Amino acid sequence: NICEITEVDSTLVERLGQRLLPWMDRLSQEQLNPSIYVGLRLSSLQAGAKEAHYLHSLKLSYQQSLLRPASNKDDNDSEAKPSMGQLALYLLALRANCEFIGGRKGDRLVSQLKRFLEDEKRAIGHNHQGHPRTSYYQYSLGILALCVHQKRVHDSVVGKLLYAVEHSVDTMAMAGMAFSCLELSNLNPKQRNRINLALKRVQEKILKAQTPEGYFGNVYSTPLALQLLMGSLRPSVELGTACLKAKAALQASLQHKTFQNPLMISQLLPVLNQKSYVDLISPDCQAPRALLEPALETPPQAKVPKFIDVLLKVSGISPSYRHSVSVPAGSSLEDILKNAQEHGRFRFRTQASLSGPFLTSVLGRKAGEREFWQVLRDPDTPLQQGIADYRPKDGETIELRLVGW
């Protein structure tokens, strides 16, 4: 297949996998990450049988959190649980261990997932003058998660996805893989053709989204795009050119330490191993992988570093706020935030996610329903990394902007 990463440097892949390894010891409820597990299982690498314990931890945690009694004893909260999108990833995790969800606990979780989709269907509405409470990405992911377990969703639920496609890249890829799975599973035969046409659309929109550099959307959307596109069934001259161009671009960024985010790597590794989430229909748990070993040697400087002077600014709220910080080069945006909070009038709140700390509130102003704290480098360039991974450059002005999407 022309859209497959045929050639990759084994030491690059091993470095990437090396970045996920420490996470296999991070088993608290907020650190646990079904996406990392799936990434590794679909990869050419293995993280010890640290893996089995990880999955087992996922099972105990996702069950005890999501299956808690009819009403909790006088709290209405105590210990915030995984979301439904995360449940969908947990289901992908099970398949990656060649397990089908089952038992009474299994049924209850499948139900929770289906209820989620049903509720998103209702939020979207009638004839689509309305948004999903979460997003089309999780909508698609839910469908794909149930599909790989041979679980059928309502024709009306799939309809909502089809319609949204029929009338960015990351969402397209994920919607695509859901459709791709529905087709190969024949779980909604009553819309067999409608789905086939939706795939062609998805392929079209992704190629249209290709940048001068070769990425589909951006470097980080590229692996998911490739996950869907290696699924072929529409081999094309335009598609071959696009895929070759996309691949060169991806391999180039790999030489430059572009992927640092654990979730990103977990989406990349399957691709560098010619696998996608659609392979979870029938996973191959017999294939051997290369054992990753503790890196265990992070090089010591004993030098005085460079410092960077960076300007922090906050907009989209009254009043606006600015802050001057000089910190050691290589410091993350999150470090700069904690610094400003520690040594000044700044304050912020993040909440946990599978991509790490998601900035939810700045200066006591929390983003509401269709708002979010956008992060940009001046002038007006939205960052492509979150606070924990983005390491600002010298001279930069970094903007936390409350936006209405």
List of residues contacting ligand B12 (CB under 6 A): 83, 85-86, 89, 134-135, 137-138, 170-171, 217-218, 220-221, 224, 261, 264, 353-359, 372-375, 382-387, 389, 405
Contact positions with Cl ion (CB under 5 A) in 100-119: 108
Based on CB atoms, which residue is closest to ligand B12, 73 or 256? 256
349 binds, among Cl ion, ligand B12, none (CB under 5 to 8 A by kind): Cl ion
CB-count burial class (<10 Å; 0-12, 13-18, 19+) for 159: middle
Q: Quick one: 163 or 372, whose CB is closer to Cl ion?
A: 372
Q: Is 31 a residue that touches Cl ion (CB under 5 A)? A: no
CB-wise, 382 or 395, nearer to ligand B12?
382
| Residue in the block written with tokens 């999903």 | 132
Q: Which two tokens stand for residue 233?
A: 């069934």
Given a contact cutoff of 8 angstroms between Cβ atoms, the answer to whether 358 and 343 are in contact is no
Q: How far is the CB of 187 from ligand B12 (least distance, A)?
A: 22
Q: What is the CA radius of gyration of the chain?
A: 22
279: three-class secondary structure by DSSP: helix
CA distances from 100 to 103, 268, 291, 400 (A): 10, 24, 26, 43
390 assigned binding-site residue: no
Two tokens at 140?
Answer: 């698609």
Q: Which two tokens stand for residue 350?
A: 């993040």
* Residue 347 touches which of ligand B12, Cl ion, none (Cβ within 5-8 Å per kind): Cl ion
Cis peptide before 270 (omega within 30 of 0): no
Block residue for tokens 């335009």: 238
CB nearer to ligand B12: give 90 or 179. 90
Minimum distance of ligand B12 from residue 382's CB (angstroms): 4
Smaller CB distance to ligand B12: residue 22 or 382? 382
48: left (phi over 0), alpha (psi -120 to 50) or beta: left
**Residue stretches of the annotated binding site:** 86, 134-138, 168-170, 218, 221, 267, 373-375
- Interface residues toward Cl ion, by CB under 5 A: 108, 260-261, 264, 347, 349, 361, 364, 385, 389
**Residue stretches of the annotated binding site for cob(II)alamin:** 86, 134-138, 168-170, 218, 221, 267, 373-375
